[PDB]
Amino acid sequence: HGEKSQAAFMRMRTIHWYDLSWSKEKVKINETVEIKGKFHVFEGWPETVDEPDVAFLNVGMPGPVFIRKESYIGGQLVPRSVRLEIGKTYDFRVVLKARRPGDWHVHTMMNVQGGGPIIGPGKWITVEGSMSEFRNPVTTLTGQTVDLENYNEGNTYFWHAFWFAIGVAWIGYWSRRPIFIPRLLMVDAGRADELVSATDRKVAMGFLAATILIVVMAMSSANSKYPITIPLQAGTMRGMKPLELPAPTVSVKVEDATYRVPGRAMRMKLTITNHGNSPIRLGEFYTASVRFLDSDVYKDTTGYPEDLLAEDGLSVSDNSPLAPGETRTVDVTASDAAWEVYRLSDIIYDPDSRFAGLLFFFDATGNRQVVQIDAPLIPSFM
Amino acid sequence: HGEKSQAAFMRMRTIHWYDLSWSKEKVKINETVEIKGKFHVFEGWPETVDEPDVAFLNVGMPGPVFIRKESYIGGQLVPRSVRLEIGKTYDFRVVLKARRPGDWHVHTMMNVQGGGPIIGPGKWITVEGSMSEFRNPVTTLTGQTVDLENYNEGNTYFWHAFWFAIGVAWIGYWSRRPIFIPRLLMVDAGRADELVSATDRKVAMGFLAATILIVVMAMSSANSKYPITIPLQAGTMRGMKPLELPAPTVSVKVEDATYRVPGRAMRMKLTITNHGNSPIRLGEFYTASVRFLDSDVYKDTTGYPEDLLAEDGLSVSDNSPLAPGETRTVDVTASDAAWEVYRLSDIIYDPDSRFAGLLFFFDATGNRQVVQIDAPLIPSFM
Amino acid sequence: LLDKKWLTFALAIYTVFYLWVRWYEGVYGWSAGLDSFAPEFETYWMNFLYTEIVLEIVTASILWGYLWKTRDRNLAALTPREELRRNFTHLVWLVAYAWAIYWGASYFTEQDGTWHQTIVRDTDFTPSHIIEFYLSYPIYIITGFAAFIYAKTRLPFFAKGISLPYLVLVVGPFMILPNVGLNEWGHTFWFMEELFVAPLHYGFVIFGWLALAVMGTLTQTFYSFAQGGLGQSLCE
Ligand SMILES: CCCCCCCCCCCC(=O)OC[C@H](COP(=O)(O)OCC[N+](C)(C)C)OC(=O)CCCCCCCCCCC
Ligand SMILES: CCCCCCCCCCCC(=O)OC[C@H](COP(=O)(O)OCC[N+](C)(C)C)OC(=O)CCCCCCCCCCC
Ligand SMILES: CCCCCCCCCCCC(=O)OC[C@H](COP(=O)(O)OCC[N+](C)(C)C)OC(=O)CCCCCCCCCCC
Ligand SMILES: CCCCCCCCCC(=O)OC[C@H](COP(=O)(O)OCC[N+](C)(C)C)OC(=O)CCCCCCCCC
Ligand SMILES: CCCCCCCCCC(=O)OC[C@H](COP(=O)(O)OCC[N+](C)(C)C)OC(=O)CCCCCCCCC
Ligand SMILES: CCCCCC(=O)OC[C@H](COP(=O)(O)OCC[N+](C)(C)C)OC(=O)CCCCC
Ligand SMILES: CCCCCC(=O)OC[C@H](COP(=O)(O)OCC[N+](C)(C)C)OC(=O)CCCCC
Ligand SMILES: CCCCCCCCCC
Ligand SMILES: CCCCCCCCCC
Ligand SMILES: CCCCCCCCCC
Ligand SMILES: OCCCC(F)(F)F
Ligand SMILES: [Cu+2]
Ligand SMILES: [Cu+2]
Ligand SMILES: [Cu+2]
Ligand SMILES: [Cu+2]
Ligand SMILES: [Cu+2]
Question: Which residues does the annotation say bind Cu cation 3 (chains A, B)?
Fold first, then answer.
């Protein structure tokens, strides 16, 4: 819900999310929904964004309407920040547990230490039930099971109320007598030395000694109880395992790319060379969370968000099968209302008019090839 | 013209320029001259120079005596800063259009974000004609052709003169009356309240309102005209394609390297091992823009600058053909007046007495091998 | 008599000398002045540096010594008319100082920009480094010191004490010249980017601010003008 405002070229060339899947579209309270997919770190990472040396796999959502039970990059849990390598493709998996009823737009996002949020596609997930039914149990290494919704809440309230009461008692003790104007007049007109006299000093000594003694006793008691404590666990985690993708058998060279101002379409001319031994066909163009599909070649079945999915938004001038070894140049047009709804047309406002995306090529048997394209995007006005 | 002053070791180990060529040596006004070649980023990049993460392909020249029409790294245009990788070799091409008559020393240079200028070899290029004949036409996406020499000059002059006239009118309006001493005396001796009276306040209100209104109207008019504008296009460009050089079949180990103080010669002992299947011979030693050639092995035909070219400056103790598989150790002396003219002898003043360079090995058929050498450079005094 | 034609000479000498300097640097900027290790650079710019430094030292010594030696011992017995004439002469000195300050801190300083931001750079003594740091700076320093000394030695208002605004106006812009050390240390080492707005440029700027003391200096000169011959007319 935080994208459509970021720069179009920065959304195009940071991170490409694909193979996204959602386990469920509608859940009950305490029910789990799993989000899977892959993201590729673009080679032409913008210089204004710091390299993803420190990155965190986050969830785009309006507060804890879900709780993040687990999150994985590769196959290993990532509760801390992680290091990503430019040009690598990683697979991710986020497990969410429903907490608050309603209709929520859930995004998978990557926060980069020096570049800000990179928001992936968002999907509407319905939560039904009552928040009062939500439980977040956890078992500690000390052998006790607690609910994270209310654990330590009573202790926190008690201690804060106790110290607030001590301070209020001090202030009220000094506030029983007249406060401002008579005391000001006494201090000004001659030496005061009358508004602070025993047993006021004795009361202050008692307050100070009691404060120190209570702090020490409370610390000792909180050490006898909970004798086993550990510090906060933090630190960027290295050695994220990237996907070992096979080398693509399709090479694509972008010969100019244009978009009409104003308009809802993007046009580019591609020289596609088919290696390997199977006839390929262009089936998809993904630019920034928007999938332009050639419906005659490929159809989406993973429940991709409709406002981000162009079922027939990809038109190829000659999308006949490309025989192996054959090279041809075609005009590819990606047109959909999403191009203007998600403000991908506002790249005219950007200080770097370059686009990046993913082309998905499909053969007859159905196996697909992913190739990455990037080129300057030239607006056309007449 | 800015080298010969930089540190000798820093000129030796930053970037090695070779295969340099110039399309023309003498040009007319509006005529194009193209500079081509390769540069290799040295692996032992000095720590005092920031890594070439942000680098710009520039031209060393005394002001716009040429205009940079195009510049390429790899095969793609690079009007912005680019990212280079240490140890990689890139090919470059700069297209210059003559603008100012005269004899100009044109250098190809690489500016690094945190290290400063790395100046390559410079060549004298003669320009003949008149500056008045120079044209720099360009066609915009709005369908108009303008000359960059004088486009918008009239508008700039008009607006600056208009605002300067407004300010001068304000100052003169207040300067018609006596200015400094009577006004100072009036302000000092009693309340002034007489030198600023209506209609002075009315004139100031008119000035303020007219200024705001004129700014708003001028902005609106400059928006109605030129309705299509884009911000400045900036940003470091990643994904520079380096040359895929074959692995060299020659391995060279530097066993000590010395230079006489004072002197014009550098001496080093190399252990050369010939792999592959052809007899090789040492033909060139390039250290910092200076090419020491063994004239019996190789001759320069690319019109390299004479003051940087040592035709017989490279003497090898035994430069007989090196049979494949054979290893021999020879004494190599690089001697030329350039070693002192370009202050390569001043490495004795440097805080890091290490040299780097390129050795070019040629076989009978003429195909060449490039090997890189780097070692401490030990001065000798007696 | 009062204000005489010394003001015309004060303007004209700086104008003519600096126009000739600009012609010289236009002729020898390129072509004996690009390569700091060429022999012609030594004959056209290093010799210029040496000659200008020697001449500046000699001129400063002679001018300041003459102004101090010819100081008015009997300032008490100075008539108001003579005081008015001396005030006008001091104003001419201040005009010369303002003209020299312009030529030094605006013209040749932004010529350092046009030069360092277009040339491949090479030494601490580029032709722009010979003209701006070591000619125009010294010249305006000499003029400012001479104006201060003239005020102190001829004007009773500026006598019997060192005026703080005048001292700041005279010494702060002078501090730009030793600040050149920060410049050299500020490009060779720290900052290889030819940025002119780099913090190594702060010492000059900070000390360029001290020229704002001309405001207090000028109200002091106004009071000195309006001592005996303040009028009448003014405030009457
Ligand atoms: C506050 C006190 C300031 C003191 C410093 C003053 C610096 C003066 C210039 C230094 C020159 C130098 O050092 O160079 C010496 C130059 C080098 O040129 P050249 O190779 O002989 O060529 C021939 C000479 N042309 C190229 C000038 C034609 O020749 C000279 O003899 C000429 C110097 C003339 C300076 C006086 C004229 C100034 C303009 C008129 C209004 C005053
Ligand atoms: C208002 C201030 C006036 C000062 C005038 C200058 C007096 C110089 C005395 C002799 C010093 C010397 O000869 O030695 C200085 C050494 C030279 O070193 P070198 O050339 O590298 O090698 C050694 C070569 N010897 C052995 C032949 C010397 O150190 C330096 O590099 C410092 C030189 C920069 C001086 C900057 C002065 C700027 C003045 C500007 C006036 C408007
Ligand atoms: C009593 C208070 C006086 C203190 C002032 C003393 C001068 C400080 C010297 C710094 C040396 C140091 O500390 O370290 C030196 C560091 C080491 O960096 P490097 O790894 O070589 O970076 C390599 C980058 N190059 C290649 C560009 C160097 O270079 C610096 O970053 C210099 C920082 C600038 C500090 C000077 C600011 C002066 C302020 C002037 C405004 C009027
Ligand atoms: C090549 C260098 C030539 C410099 C000539 C300096 C002239 C001598 C300075 C001087 O004392 O006064 C010259 C003029 C007129 O003032 P004078 O009345 O001569 O000064 C003394 C005042 N007194 C007569 C009552 C005792 O006062 C002025 O306004 C002269 C201004 C000259 C401009 C400053 C030039 C400095 C360049 C470095
Ligand atoms: C370099 C940086 C300057 C540092 C700033 C310190 C000076 C600021 C205060 C000042 O200018 O006062 C010194 C006198 C003014 O008169 P006084 O300070 O009252 O003392 C006069 C006696 N004295 C000449 C020996 C000083 O003024 C003079 O007498 C100067 C003229 C005499 C000097 C001439 C010789 C110099 C040749 C190079
Ligand atoms: C208030 C500052 C005036 C600065 C003017 C200036 O720098 O003039 C040099 C420039 C040089 O260009 P140009 O006139 O074509 O003569 C070229 C001669 N050189 C190359 C030596 C400067 O133009 C002039 O000489 C005009 C005269 C203006 C008198 C106030
Ligand atoms: C009043 C504002 C001063 C801010 C200083 C500043 O902008 O410094 C930038 C610089 C950052 O260096 P950077 O801009 O990256 O320089 C790039 C070029 N090199 C690496 C050659 C210096 O930081 C420092 O080195 C410390 C400055 C101390 C000021 C008292
Ligand atoms: C002046 C008060 C110092 C209190 C120190 C208490 C130490 C208790 C150790 C558990
Ligand atoms: C107080 C003056 C504010 C001026 C605002 C003008 C807005 C014009 C929009 C084009
Ligand atoms: C590289 C970060 C430099 C930060 C400089 C801060 C300057 C602040 C001046 C008070
Ligand atoms: O004082 C010279 C101006 C900026 C620089 F980059 F050249 F250093
Ligand atoms: Cu959303
Ligand atoms: Cu990608
Ligand atoms: Cu040169
Ligand atoms: Cu190299
Ligand atoms: Cu500087």
Answer: 105, 107
d(CA A61, CA A48): 26
Write the CB contacts of A199 (distance below 8 Å, at least 6 apart in sequence): none
Helix (H) or strand (E) holding A272: strand A265-274
Q: What CATH number should be reported for the domain holding residue B172?
A: 1.10.287.710
Give the span between the Cα atoms of A35 and A70, in whole angstroms. 10
Cα–Cα distance for residue pair B171/B180, rounded to 1 Å: 13
Last residue of a domain, one of A175, A203, A232: A232
Q: Are residues A107 and A158 in the same domain?
A: no
Rounded distance between C-alpha atoms, residue B35 and residue B105, angstroms: 13
Rounded Cα–Cα distance for residues A81 and A67 (Å)? 18
Determine the Cα–Cα distance for residues A241 and B111; give it in Å rounded to an integer: 36
Distance C109 CA to ligand 16 centre (A): 10
**CA atoms in the 13 A half-sphere facing the CB of C120:** 28
B-chain CB neighbours of A349 within 8 Å are 230-231
Binding-site residue set of B for Cu cation? 1, 16, 40, 105, 107
Q: Is C184 in the pocket of ligand 11 (CB under 6 A)?
A: no
According to DSSP, the residues that pair with B259 across neighbouring strands are: B266, B379
| A353/B232 touch (CB, cutoff 8 Å), yes or no | no
Residues B6, B101 share a domain: yes
Q: If you measure CA to CA, which chain A residue comes closest to B54?
A: A47
**How many structural domains compose chain A?**
3
Alpha helix (H) ranges present in chain A? 8-12, 153-175, 181-188, 200-224, 338-341
- Which structural domain range is residue B215 located in? 136-232
Give Cα separations from B322 to B286, B325, B371 (angstroms).
20, 8, 15
CB of B4 less than 8 A from some CB of C: yes
Could you give the CA distance from residue B318 to residue B331 in angstroms, rounded to a whole number?
A: 8
Please list every residue in chain A whose beta carbon sits closer than 8 Å to the beta carbon of residue B228: 261, 381
> Do A144 and A121 belong to one domain?
no
Domain boundary among A246, A277, A297: A246
Report the DSSP beta bridge partners of residue B26.
B126
Beta-carbon contacts of B198 under 8 Å, excluding residues fewer than 6 positions away, are: none
Share in percent of chain B as helix, strand, coil (round to 5): 20, 40, 40
CATH of residue A360's domain is 2.60.40.1580
Q: How many CA atoms lie within 13 A of B148 on its CB side?
A: 10
**Chain A hits for B235, Cβ within 8 Å:** 46-48, 351-352
- Under 8 Å between Cβ of A57 and A37: no
Q: What is the resolution of this structure in A?
A: 2.2
Q: Which helix (H) or strand (E) holds A18?
A: strand A15-22
Taking alpha carbons only, the member of C30, C60, C5, A191 closest to residue B105 is C30
Residues comprising chain A, all counted: 382
Cα B307 from Cα B295, distance rounded (Å): 16
Angle between helices C137-154 and C80-102 (to 10 degrees): 170
The ligand with the least distance to the CA atom of B103 is 14
Rounded to the nearest whole angstrom, what is the distance from the C-alpha of residue B48 to the centroid of ligand 3? 13
Q: Is B46 on the interface with C (CB under 8 A)?
A: no
Does residue A361 sit in the same domain as residue A303?
yes
**B93 and B170 assigned to the same domain:** no
Same-domain check for residues B260 and B111: no
Question: Same domain for B238 and B124?
Answer: yes
- Ligand 2 geometric centre to CA of C138 (Å): 16
Q: Are residues A100 and A167 in the same domain?
A: no
- Residue type for position C129: H
- Cα A24 from chain centroid? 19
